[PDB]
Amino acid sequence: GVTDHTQRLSIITKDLFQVAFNRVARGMLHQDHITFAMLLARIKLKGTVGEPTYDAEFQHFLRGNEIVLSAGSTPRIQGLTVEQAEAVVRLSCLPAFKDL
């Protein structure tokens, strides 16, 4: 029914990710559906127009444990558990969360 080339291309692009997930996740364990959907979302975010790369934010999301904090360097925050405060100080290395 749709004839315009741009609309058809957009429909194809959406259905590519949708059908890829439908075909693959039917063959994965339910715990691994979210991983593949996350990867597909990251692929679409890479391919989309008008959105930043978010390479630093995703890089942190993956390996923020690599951010080293010295023993005692992490301050104690009221109402926050020690591991929570550790994660907070690790997240504060990003410029967006400097005043976290």
Curated annotation (Swiss-Prot):
Compartmental location: Cytoplasm, Cytoskeleton
Entry's transmembrane regions: none
Disease connection: Charcot-Marie-Tooth disease, axonal, type 2O: An axonal form of Charcot-Marie-Tooth disease, a disorder of the peripheral nervous system, characterized by progressive weakness and atrophy, initially of the peroneal muscles and later of the distal muscles of the arms. Charcot-Marie-Tooth disease is classified in two main groups on the basis of electrophysiologic properties and histopathology: primary peripheral demyelinating neuropathies (designated CMT1 when they are dominantly inherited) and primary peripheral axonal neuropathies (CMT2). Cortical dysplasia, complex, with other brain malformations 13: An autosomal dominant disorder characterized by global developmental delay with impaired intellectual development. Some patients show signs of peripheral neuropathy, such as abnormal gait and hyporeflexia. CDCBM13 is associated with variable neuronal migration defects resulting in cortical malformations.
Family: Belongs to the dynein heavy chain family.
Domain remarks: Dynein heavy chains probably consist of an N-terminal stem (which binds cargo and interacts with other dynein components), and the head or motor domain. The motor contains six tandemly-linked AAA domains in the head, which form a ring. A stalk-like structure (formed by two of the coiled coil domains) protrudes between AAA 4 and AAA 5 and terminates in a microtubule-binding site. A seventh domain may also contribute to this ring; it is not clear whether the N-terminus or the C-terminus forms this extra domain.
Reported function: Cytoplasmic dynein 1 acts as a motor for the intracellular retrograde motility of vesicles and organelles along microtubules. Dynein has ATPase activity; the force-producing power stroke is thought to occur on release of ADP. Plays a role in mitotic spindle assembly and metaphase plate congression.
UniProt subunit comment: Homodimer. The cytoplasmic dynein 1 complex consists of two catalytic heavy chains (HCs) and a number of non-catalytic subunits presented by intermediate chains (ICs), light intermediate chains (LICs) and light chains (LCs); the composition seems to vary in respect to the IC, LIC and LC composition. The heavy chain homodimer serves as a scaffold for the probable homodimeric assembly of the respective non-catalytic subunits. The ICs and LICs bind directly to the HC dimer and dynein LCs assemble on the IC dimer. Interacts with DYNC1LI1; DYNC1LI1 and DYNC1LI2 bind mutually exclusive to DYNC1H1.
Name of the protein in its database record: Cytoplasmic dynein 1 heavy chain 1
Organism this protein belongs to: Homo sapiens (Human)
Gene: DYNC1H1
Span covered, complete protein: 3848 to 3947 of 4646
